[PDB]
Design an enzyme around this catalytic site. Structure first.
Site, short mmCIF file in Angstrom:
data_model
loop_
_atom_site.label_atom_id
_atom_site.label_comp_id
_atom_site.label_asym_id
_atom_site.label_seq_id
_atom_site.Cartn_x
_atom_site.Cartn_y
_atom_site.Cartn_z
N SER A 120 0.81 -1.21 0.00
CA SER A 120 0.00 0.00 0.00
C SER A 120 0.85 1.27 0.00
O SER A 120 0.42 2.30 -0.53
CB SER A 120 -0.94 0.00 1.20
N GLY A 121 2.04 1.22 0.59
CA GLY A 121 2.93 2.36 0.61
C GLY A 121 3.86 2.49 -0.57
O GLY A 121 4.87 3.20 -0.50
N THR B 87 -1.52 5.46 -5.20
CA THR B 87 -2.40 6.62 -5.30
C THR B 87 -1.85 7.70 -6.22
O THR B 87 -2.60 8.30 -7.00
CB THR B 87 -2.65 7.20 -3.91
N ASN C 205 3.77 -3.02 7.29
CA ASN C 205 3.77 -1.56 7.24
C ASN C 205 2.43 -0.98 7.68
O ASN C 205 1.38 -1.62 7.62
CB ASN C 205 4.09 -1.05 5.83
N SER D 276 -1.89 -0.32 5.34
CA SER D 276 -2.16 -1.31 4.30
C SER D 276 -3.65 -1.28 3.96
O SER D 276 -4.49 -1.48 4.84
CB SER D 276 -1.73 -2.70 4.77
N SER D 277 -3.96 -1.02 2.69
CA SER D 277 -5.33 -1.16 2.22
C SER D 277 -5.73 -2.63 2.16
O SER D 277 -5.00 -3.46 1.60
CB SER D 277 -5.48 -0.52 0.84
N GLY E 26 -0.80 -6.53 -3.62
CA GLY E 26 -0.02 -7.62 -4.13
C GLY E 26 0.10 -8.80 -3.19
O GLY E 26 -0.47 -8.84 -2.10
N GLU F 144 1.31 -11.62 -0.57
CA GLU F 144 1.58 -11.33 0.83
C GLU F 144 2.01 -12.58 1.59
O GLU F 144 1.27 -13.57 1.61
CB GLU F 144 0.34 -10.73 1.49
#
Ligand SMILES: C/C1=C\[C@H](C)C[C@H](C)OC(=O)C[C@H](c2ccc(O)cc2)NC(=O)[C@@H](Cc2c(Br)[nH]c3ccccc23)N(C)C(=O)[C@H](C)NC(=O)[C@@H](C)C1
Ligand SMILES: Nc1ncnc2c1ncn2[C@@H]1O[C@H](COP(=O)(O)OP(=O)(O)O)[C@@H](O)[C@H]1O
Ligand SMILES: [Mg+2]
Lengths: 139, 751, 371
Positions: free
Chosen positions: B157-158, B162, B206, B209-210, B432, B434
């Site tokens: 997510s990081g 976006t 992290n 995380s979405s 992605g 995991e």
């Protein structure tokens, strides 16, 4: 080598003797061979020299009689042209490109040596007729 | 072999995953002699079997296409990103069709308008890679052919998803002429902090995380100018609402709401400190380092107000979340072995009623008892405490999933615009692959979703390249599909892990131990991809496309249970006190369906939404762990490149004909090898002699009509033999000129 | 596709789809034929009536049960009842749906043969299974250990089960029943001077039993109290609004289940056959079969039977080892609920008898697979 050849080679060898002991340095052996018509590579020169170390290459001295087997060993056209045609197809070669390849690949020479040998052979575009330059340097 | 002295190879190190070396010696069929910048001369050691990966030559290194490289392996893909990213600071990169984007932390200038205009005319190969080249190819496809177009963005997510989306949206707005007509961009970017707040959670690897797929449609008029936008969401992590592993958090909006409890507005909610509540406490770790929760709140609410939510709907939503939190603290005391009761004047239910409106007495009765209806008659049946807990947690999950679908649809009401949409481009942000030291049902669902997207990705690449071989008149049978149905049939199909888990949910006295012990009969010897970890019986291993992944069973059964009793939601639906709660549950087996079956359906809708469409791909890799404005850290980037399937796209394509060349550029370098004896009138015919003489095995390459296709590794081979013939000429000239200049030094010295 | 799940005893048929939580169609297993001369012309005379028709019409009809004690006694009526169930009540073609059928243990084997043969020949059902009524109750009660006491109309049986293993050497089977409770209730009511001689009257007495019986926490105390007080005595209305008082006889009828000597069996009641079934199996197990007792089928629903057994066994069994009795309100439907659960397991889908394996082997295969 016959007696006449040995005499001419010995005289030339003694001209390269800068110490008076009748000897040259290992590092001068290649220079003497080239003055005598041989064209060995540094790898070939070190091999016929017995792959000497830096210290003995720069300070160990050998007389003509010990040098001679090495000269013999070194002693014992269309490719040259194609080799120059590698860097062409109008019969020219950039001076910058020839300078780069001679100063950066293989057994690299100095920029001053390359400037000296290349002086007067390149035109206004900075192109060398390589068939003429080759004949000149082989003469 | 290809190995010879003065060749280079990649050697493993801990400090960075590979090291470059040169051979001091020829190889022979043992030890190798190696040159290294530090401890420069070394034994190297040969496995009793492999050789070190041979290294690409330096004309190819640094190019824009990672599959233009001749040797394809982890070291080369590490290196070629490394070089541009630190030395060039060129961040976008191509792998096959897939676009690799490495996150800078500095904001680069390159996104400005002038470059957008400069791209707008130019096809996929006509430029260096950039996000606008994907957004353009999508826009061109949509204009060139009706079919709607997808963009897909993957990573942690990081990894800057976006921002890669936001610039694509700028590309559409600016190119479409459409700037006056609507702002989607201002609306999308003002919507983001809401769905980040409700959607995301800290995961131990992290922050932020979405946990859901987020999908956005950008709609066009038939004049290919923007109308507006529509969201959809998929794959939400319904399980996370009630359960966390250690060092994880529940969704941010709960913590934000609890941190806001100082404010007078929320006084009635009677929210305690964020670790007083049983749903928030369990992770142990109520503070994310580096954020003010209460200060995120004021942006969350500003984004709601800017997005047209009622000022009183916001208090409604928070009233409901506070309801869930108060609900969790309800505690059951058993009457009997087989029956349980809520104790007198129990506080949190008393507050949950005054929040939701429903009577205390009917809630307290229905929580303690199930209702069964035969056709003629009905039985109020009591239920065990262990059932009543999973009932309450199912109701909490059901409330949250409805509140999320309502908030999304009110977002859509703002985004949507009333012109009828001719077609759309759609942009998708998804987790992605995991894998953590422990893996659990959340990761099993994430990895199943990933590997099912990966199947579509494989089949789409296999279509595009069977086209490219068809146009250029090769036999296309030369290259063969690569297929992970054998694994999906393990996860998805009947007598599969999710199916035996649903069976163990309903079977009496089911448990994790008997679930694993029922897997090990059916799969363990029978199926080539299912494997048992040797020292344990609570765990099982699955080979995915990416890697082997070990899943613990211990948690894994409880997370799959969902069943919501009809009375318990009917009570809420009847509630008097405020609008929104009846609005949520508006229009079965849906209450019976397990979480894994709801997810197995949600993903299948996501797949129908994508398979309608001809996707485009972006991958995001986060190149260092510590947010440094620029650094590149190879041990992290490896893990990213594996988790984002780049290394599998490459491992597949390396069995292909990855390396692909124009006949003119092939003359352009390799006339040096070509004897001008042979250099000939017709380029398409000339090289057919040369290549088949230089490369004694004809199977290693193919003559396309307009391009040449080599197998991996034989471009660098041709470059080696060119470099050798150049070296030989360099020797012959330097030999001559050395001899001449020494003779002239002798002329100087004598005379 | 969903399997069908069907349960038939000599009382109600229960049918529905697997995965549902309650049976879709419930009707008495009765086939009725007219006993009077049809007088009207164009009356619309009908060869036979099935289930709820045979209830509504019943006074004009005579009413016959095709099952005595789980044993199907004449097949053509059974076939009629199935036909009515699938086509009329479920309204779903049986060619497309696997079917699950339920039976009492220690039945005649031919009953399973013919029950299979009709499914494959006459409905062409794509696959089939048979289950023991006692096994399916543990799924409905959520256990893999216990002794299933199950009694409807027809058979009464005990099957002990431990950790998913049944123990054939300890199975018990008896022929007290809701039916022989009804026929005893008819017999004894004659002492209050009320008589019922006909099948349709028996269907009245059955409703008298269903509403008004209860099981005496102590028999002899209430046998004294009914001599002592009218306060026990309860009154009921016949279909025509004549009204009858009933006495001690309302408790006294289900007392026979505890003492079959009243009907005139030499046997011991369901309590002592429960105890002897426990005693028939290993002392290692026994504590667990005291820890779970699961009551199935309609006759268990008499108010206070559970407390009567919890007293009776605790008095009987070794004093310290605790007894518990587990009697879920659903239990009248528990055998169907259990079949719903079983037919929706994915492991079970392996185990349906296929049409192929029947057509190779003839009906007898059912003996290989089913038990
Ligand atoms: C004269 C005797 C037998 C019979 C009249 C002789 C005939 C010849 O046997 C049959 O084949 C007929 C039939 C039968 C019915 C259907 C079927 O597919 C096959 C056979 N079976 C029956 O009538 C059974 C039914 C039954 C009761 Br209830 N519980 C039981 C528990 C287990 C098994 C079966 C049952 N039945 C009532 C009896 O045995 C009676 C109690 N037996 C006797 O008094 C003794 C002295 C022997
Ligand atoms: N609520 C009730 N109380 C007492 N007896 C009942 C009740 N319901 C049904 N019965 C009796 O139990 C028998 C039906 O039992 P059941 O198990 O449903 O039959 P089956 O075994 O065919 O399903 C009948 O004798 C019926 O009169
Ligand atoms: Mg029964």
């Amino acid at each position: 080598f016959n007696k006449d050849q040995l005499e001419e080679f010995k005289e030339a060898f003694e001209l390269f003797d800068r110490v008076g002991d009748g000897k040259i340095l290992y590092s001068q052996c290649g220079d003497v061979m080239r003055a005598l018509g041989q064209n060995p590579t540094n790898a070939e020169v070190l091999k016929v020299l017995g792959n000497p170390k830096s210290d003995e290459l720069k300070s160990r001295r050998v007389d003509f009689e010990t040098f001679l087997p090495m000269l013999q060993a070194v002693a014992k056209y269309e490719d040259y042209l194609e080799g120059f045609r590698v860097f062409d197809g109008n019969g020219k070669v950039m001076g910058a490109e020839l300078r780069h390849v001679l100063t950066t690949l293989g057994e690299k020479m100095t920029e001053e040596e390359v400037e000296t040998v290349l002086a007067g052979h390149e035109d206004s575009n900075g192109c060398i007729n390589y068939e003429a330059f080759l004949k000149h340097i082989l003469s | 072999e290809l190995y010879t002295k003065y060749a280079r190879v990649w050697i493993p190190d801990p400090e960075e995953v590979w090291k470059s070396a040169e051979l001091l010696k020829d190889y022979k069929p043992k030890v190798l002699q190696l040159r290294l910048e530090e401890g420069k001369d070394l034994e190297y050691c040969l496995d009793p079997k492999e050789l070190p990966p041979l290294r690409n030559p330096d004309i190819l290194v640094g190019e824009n296409d990672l599959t233009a490289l001749s040797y394809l392996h982890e070291p080369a893909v590490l290196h070629n990103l490394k070089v541009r990213f630190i030395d060039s600071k060129l961040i976008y990169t191509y792998c096959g069709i897939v676009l690799v984007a490495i996150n800078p932390y500095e904001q680069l200038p390159i996104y400005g308008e002038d470059i957008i205009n400069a791209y707008s005319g130019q096809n996929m190969g006509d430029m260096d890679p950039h996000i606008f080249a994907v957004a353009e190819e999508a826009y061109k496809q949509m204009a060139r052919d009706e079919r709607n177009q997808s963009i897909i963005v993957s990573g942690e997510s990081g990894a800057g998803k976006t921002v890669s989306a936001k610039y694509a949206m700028r590309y559409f707005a600016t190119v479409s002429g459409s700037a006056s007509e609507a702002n989607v961009e201002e609306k999308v970017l003002a919507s983001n902090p809401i769905m980040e707040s409700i959607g995301n959670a800290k995961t131990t690897r992290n922050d932020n995380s979405s946990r859901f797929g987020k999908y956005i449609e950008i709609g066009f008029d038939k004049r290919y100018r923007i109308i507006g936008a529509n969201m959809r969401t998929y794959l939400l992590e319904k399980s996370r609402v009630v359960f966390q592993a250690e060092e994880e958090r529940n969704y941010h909006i709960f913590y934000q709401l609890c941190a806001s409890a100082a404010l007078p507005e929320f006084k009635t909610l009677r929210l305690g400190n964020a670790n007083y509540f049983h749903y928030t406490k369990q992770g142990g770790s109520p503070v994310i380092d580096g954020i003010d929760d209460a200060k995120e709140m004021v942006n969350t609410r500003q984004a709601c107000t800017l997005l047209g939510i009622s000022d009183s709907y916001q208090m409604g939503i928070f009233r409901i979340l506070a309801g869930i939190l108060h609900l969790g603290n309800v505690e059951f005391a058993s009457r009997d072995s087989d029956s349980c009761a809520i104790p007198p004047k129990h506080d949190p239910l008393t507050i949950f009623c005054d929040l939701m409106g429903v009577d205390y007495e009917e809630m307290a009765h229905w929580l303690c008892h199930r209702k069964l209806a035969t056709a003629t008659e009905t039985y109020i049946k009591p239920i065990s405490k262990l059932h009543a807990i999973n009932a309450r947690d199912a109701l909490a999950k059901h409330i949250y999933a409805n509140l999320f679908n309502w908030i999304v649809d009110h977002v859509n009401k703002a985004l949507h615009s009333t012109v009828k949409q001719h077609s759309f481009i759609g942009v998708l942000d998804i987790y992605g692959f995991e894998t953590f030291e422990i893996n659990s049902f959340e990761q099993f669902c994430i990895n199943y979703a990933n590997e099912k997207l990966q199947q579509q990705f494989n089949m789409h690449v296999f279509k595009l390249e069977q086209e490219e071989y068809m146009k250029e008149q090769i036999p296309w049978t030369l290259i063969d599909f690569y297929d992970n149905q054998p694994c999906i049939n393990l996860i998805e199909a009947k007598m599969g892990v999710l199916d035996l888990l649903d069976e163990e949910c309903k079977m009496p006295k089911g448990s994790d131990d008997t679930w694993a012990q029922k897997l090990y009969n059916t799969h363990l010897n029978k199926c080539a991809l299912f494997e048992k970890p040797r020292l344990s019986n609570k765990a099982f291993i699955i080979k995915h496309f990416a890697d082997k992944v070990e899943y613990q069973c211990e948690g894994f059964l409880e997370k799959n249970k969902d069943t919501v009793y009809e009375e318990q939601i009917k009570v809420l639906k009847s509630s008097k006190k405020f609008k929104l709660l009846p609005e949520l549950f508006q229009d079965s087996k849906e209450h019976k369906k397990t979480v894994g079956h709801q997810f197995r359906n949600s993903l299948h809708l996501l797949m129908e939404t994508l398979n309608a469409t001809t996707p485009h791909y972006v991958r995001c890799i986060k190149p260092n762990d510590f947010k440094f404005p620029f650094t590149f850290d190879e041990k992290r980037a490896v893990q990213q490149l594996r988790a984002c399937g780049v290394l599998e796209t490459i491992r597949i394509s390396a069995a292909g004909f990855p390396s692909r060349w124009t006949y003119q550029e092939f003359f352009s370098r390799y006339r040096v090898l070509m004897k001008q004896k042979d250099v000939l009138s017709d380029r398409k015919q000339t090289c057919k002699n040369v290549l088949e003489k230089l490369i004694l095995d004809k199977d290693k390459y193919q003559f396309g009509k307009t391009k040449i296709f080599f197998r991996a590794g034989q471009v660098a081979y041709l470059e080696k033999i060119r470099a050798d013939k150049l070296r030989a000429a360099c020797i012959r000239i330097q030999k001559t000129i050395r001899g001449w200049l020494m003779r002239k030094k002798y002329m100087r010295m004598r005379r | 596709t969903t399997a069908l799940v069907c349960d038939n005893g000599s009382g109600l048929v229960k049918a529905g789809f697997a995965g549902d939580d309650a049976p879709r169609a419930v009707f008495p297993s009765i086939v009725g034929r007219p006993r009077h001369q049809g007088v009207m012309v164009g009356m619309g005379q009908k060869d036979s009536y099935v289930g709820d028709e045979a209830q509504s019409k019943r006074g004009i009809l005579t009413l016959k049960y095709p099952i005595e004690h789980g044993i199907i006694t004449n097949w053509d009526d059974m076939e009629k009842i199935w036909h009515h169930t699938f086509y009329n009540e479920l309204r779903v073609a049986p060619e497309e749906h696997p079917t699950l059928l339920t039976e009492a243990p220690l039945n005649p084997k031919a009953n399973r043969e013919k029950m299979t043969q009709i499914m494959f020949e006459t409905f062409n059902v794509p696959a089939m299974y048979v289950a023991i009524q006692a096994v399916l109750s543990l799924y409905a009660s959520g256990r893999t250990t216990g002794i299933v006491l199950d009694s409807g109309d027809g058979v009464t049986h005990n099957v002990p089960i431990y950790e998913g293993y049944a123990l054939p050497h300890a199975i018990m089977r008896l022929d007290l029943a809701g039916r022989d409770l009804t026929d005893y209730l008819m017999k004894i009511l004659t002492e209050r001077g009320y008589s019922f001689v006909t099948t349709a009257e028996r269907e009245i007495v059955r409703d008298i039993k269903e509403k008004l019986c209860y099981v005496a926490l102590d028999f002899e105390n209430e046998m004294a109290t009914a001599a002592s007080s009218s306060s026990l005595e309860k009154s009921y209305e016949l279909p025509d609004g004549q009204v009858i008082t009933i006495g001690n006889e309302r408790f006294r009828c289900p007392e026979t289940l505890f003492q079959p000597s009243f009907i005139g069996m030499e046997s011991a009641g369901i309590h002592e056959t429960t105890y002897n079934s426990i005693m028939k199996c290993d002392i290692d197990i026994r504590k667990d079969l005291y820890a779970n007792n699961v009551m199935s089928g309609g006759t268990t629903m008499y108010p206070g039977i559970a407390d009567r057994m919890q007293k009776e066994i605790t008095a009987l069994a070794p004093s310290t080892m605790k007894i518990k009795i587990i009697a879920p309100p659903e239990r009248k439907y528990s055998v169907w609920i259990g079949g719903s659960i079983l037919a929706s397991l994915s492991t079970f889908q392996q185990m349906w008898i296929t049409k192929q394996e029947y057509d190779e082997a003839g009906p007898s295969i059912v003996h290989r697979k089913c038990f």
